[PDB]
Amino acid sequence: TRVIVVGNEKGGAGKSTIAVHLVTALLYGGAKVAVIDLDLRQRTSARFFENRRAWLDNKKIELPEPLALNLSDNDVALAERPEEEQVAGFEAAFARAMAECDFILIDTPGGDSAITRMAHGRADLVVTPMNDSFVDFDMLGTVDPVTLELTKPSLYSLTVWEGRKQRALSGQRQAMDWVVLRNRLATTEARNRKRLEDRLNALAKRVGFRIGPGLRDRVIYRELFPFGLTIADLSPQVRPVPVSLQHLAARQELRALMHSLGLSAYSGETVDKLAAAL
Amino acid sequence: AETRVIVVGNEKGGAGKSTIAVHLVTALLYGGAKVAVIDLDLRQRTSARFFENRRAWLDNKKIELPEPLALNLSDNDVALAERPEEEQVAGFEAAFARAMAECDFILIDTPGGDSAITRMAHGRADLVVTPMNDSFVDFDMLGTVELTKPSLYSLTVWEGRKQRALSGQRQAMDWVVLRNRLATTEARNRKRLEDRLNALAKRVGFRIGPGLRDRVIYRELFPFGLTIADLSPQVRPVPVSLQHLAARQELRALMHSLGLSAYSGETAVDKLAAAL
């Protein structure tokens, strides 16, 4: 694996939280990692790493940082430019990432856009964060269990389909691995448990993805965001927030998440520096 | 590089699809081509049965009219519908190979939905023909509103284009949606319907041509396996009327939009007028 695309149809589902945690995990494993954020208007992942750089500079602390590549001098402005200019910016950034880094992580916003399609076309691994609800699963398609046939494809699944096509047309013979990461919801109703399980399994089979565990929504992530820090950075020497058992829980979820992506052996580790910081 | 493989399909099977398919077949026959017909609606087989009816009627009479090479996938295609996918695929491949060896045009009537054989038929298409009734609800079969929701039928065509390109065929596949005007259509909706189909055409990658109005005359000809082009003073097991001449004119415009005018028999004593 070198190109990892984190994508879903409508954003959310902790996508950038997952993206930036994958980045720091791979950095701690000793890789050179590039990060490209194709959510040009919101730039959640790119801003996270801008915060990391600023905070580290302010504290004169060193932690691993990625090569963060913008598409232009002003990516918020680029969002309103014609597609061809967004594509050009992406191609130049991607060229630099491939020349300089071992892993390239691309955080992508979904929609019907050239750059999202092109990013998925470069992906060795597509990571799709998905909340555990019926309305969210609709973004992957609709499969009968009237038969188990596809009845309605989704826009996002078409994006992935288009990516696999670009990849093959380009002469890359290795298959792209597509993992939907299911985020469990605190609100999930008992009446829906069996059908939620069965629906996602039916979609996995017909649409062509496999299922892994995501991250539960937690306020701890938004509290870390302004510092550009991930769970893996926290220690007695690095704790601008109180470290709690929430952080240790999140760390375990990330272990299982990374395992499902096939990336365990590339991560930093997961004495215990996080427990030490409690 | 000339059109050889024509795949007629839609999502739900209505919209005069079999009527259109069999009229394309006889037009191309009258134009001097050998034509194969393969019907992948395995349970209903409307087009296959049309040509079985034709054979039976011509045999009963002592009459020669052109007939296609009508190829089944098995000894019992209705039974085949319930068999494992790989058996359907095998039957399709064997039929298609025979058609390609023996015929100039191959017309495949397909039911859509999510089957290997419908995908494979589209993968072999030079021209995809999609009969579609003129309404907002019908157009949803092609997708929705940028694109927000793709449709299964449109994905099947896109998949076909991909298979074609993967096979080393560099010529593009042509895809025409044939818009059947409805008698129920109110005049006030004309522009809204037009704008909707044009937006879908642009994003989904099809072009639009005119279809065939629903008419009782087709149901009346079906038992005899006859199309408009067959009717004459010598061939009229139904009373010929101005409806049949109207249908003939519709077929002309349809065939023209498909790029098939120069291959048709003739959509000189007007034999249809003579039969009135």
Numbering used by the authors:
A (entry chain B): 4 to 273, 280 to 287
B (entry chain A): 2 to 146, 152 to 273, 279 to 287
Provide the publication's sentences verbatim.
Protein gradients play a central role in the spatial organization of cells, but the mechanisms of their formation are incompletely understood. This study analyzes the determinants responsible for establishing bipolar gradients of the ATPase MipZ, a key regulator of division site placement in Caulobacter crescentus. MipZ dynamically interacts with the polar ParB-parS complexes, forming a subcellular gradient with concentration maxima at the tips of the cell and a minimum at the cell center. It inhibits polymerization of the tubulin homolog FtsZ into the so-called Z ring, a structure that forms the basis of the bacterial divison apparatus (Erickson et al., 2010). MipZ belongs to the Mrp/MinD family of P loop ATPases, a heterogeneous group of proteins that act as nucleotide-dependent molecular switches (Leipe et al., 2002).
The two independent structures show excellent agreement with a root-mean-square deviation (rmsd) of 0.44 Å. Superimposition of the structures reveals that MipZ, Soj and MinD share significant similarity in the region constituting the nucleotide-binding site, with an rmsd of 2.4 Å across the 176 α-carbons forming the backbone of the conserved core. However, MipZ differs from its family relatives in the arrangement of several conserved loops. In addition, it displays a number of unique features, including a marked extension of helix 2 and a large loop between helices 9 and 10 (helices 10/11 in Soj). Notably, helices 6 and 7 of MipZ correspond to a single helix in both Soj and MinD (helix 8 in Soj). At the junction of these two helices, MipZ exhibits an unusual structural motif, consisting of a large loop that is stabilized by a short antiparallel β sheet (S6/S7). Together, these distinct characteristics are consistent with a clear evolutionary separation of MipZ from its two relatives. MipZ has no C-terminal amphipathic helix, as used for membrane attachment of MinD, and lacks the conserved DNA-binding domain characteristic of plasmid-encoded ParA proteins (Gerdes et al., 2010). Interaction analyses showed that MipZ monomers bind to ParB irrespective of their nucleotide state. Monomers are unable to interact with the nucleoid and, consequently, display high diffusional mobility, thereby rapidly returning to the polar ParB clusters.
